Amino acid sequence: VNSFSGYLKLTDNVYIKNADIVEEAKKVKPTVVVNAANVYLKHGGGVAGALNKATNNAMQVESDDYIATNGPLKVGGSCVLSGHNLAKHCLHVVGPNVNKGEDIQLLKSAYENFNQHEVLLAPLLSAGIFGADPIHSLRVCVDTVRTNVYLAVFDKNLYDKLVSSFL
Numbered sequence: 555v556n557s558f559s560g561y562l563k564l565t566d567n568v569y570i571k572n573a574d575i576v577e578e579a580k581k582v583k584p585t586v587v588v589n590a591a592n593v594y595l596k597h598g599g600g601v602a603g604a605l606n607k608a609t610n611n612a613m614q615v616e617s618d619d620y621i622a623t624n625g626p627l628k629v630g631g632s633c634v635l636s637g638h639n640l641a642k643h644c645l646h647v648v649g650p651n652v653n654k655g656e657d658i659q660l661l662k663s664a665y666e667n668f669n670q671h672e673v674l675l676a677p678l679l680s681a682g683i684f685g686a687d688p689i690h691s692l693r694v695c696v697d698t699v700r701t702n703v704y705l706a707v708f709d710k711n712l713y714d715k716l717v718s719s720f721l
């Protein structure tokens with residue numbers, strides 16, 4: 555039993571809700587919130603910009619130190635950093651950005667990072683400003699993640715389309 559509320563159950567382990575991931579994280583304080591990161595951990599917009607803004611830029615400050623020490627992530631890769639005021643940990647996961655021409659096959663590799671955590675609050679990887687089809691992202695999520703994932707979808711119209719088209 556966990557404190558995630560109002561989710562529709564898609565499969566044994568995947569749940570979905572129309573919600574602002576920032577507000578969901580502040581309410582639930584999950585062990586892990588997933589960020590839709592880029593390789594430079596530059597949290598300018600989309601989910602990343604919103605999460606970072608909610609931390610009063612502390613996420614960006616921590617991320618800049620991480621990059622200065624370790625260099626960029628790989629597309630499909632991840633790192634665990636602080637969750638600040640939103641969660642215990644933030645799993646920064648880099649899905650491919652279609653608007654950069656990155657290989658959509660890397661989306662499965664990106665979702666594999668979720669399997670290192672028993673429970674996560676997450677957005678759909680590569681959706682939004684990353685340019686991929688969110689219906690495809692949900693399919694890859696369901697077929698790749700085996701741990702318990704609670705997906706927050708900001709756009710109500712998109713949420714309804716994802717549910718109604720889910721096989």
Ligand SMILES: Nc1nnc(SCCn2c(=O)oc3ccccc32)s1
Nearest residue numbers: 555556557558582583584585586673
């Ligand atoms: N594995 C999980 N992580 N985060 C959640 S949600 C937030 C509240 N919370 C809960 O309901 O169960 C919990 C177990 C440990 C820590 C927090 C818990 S479940």
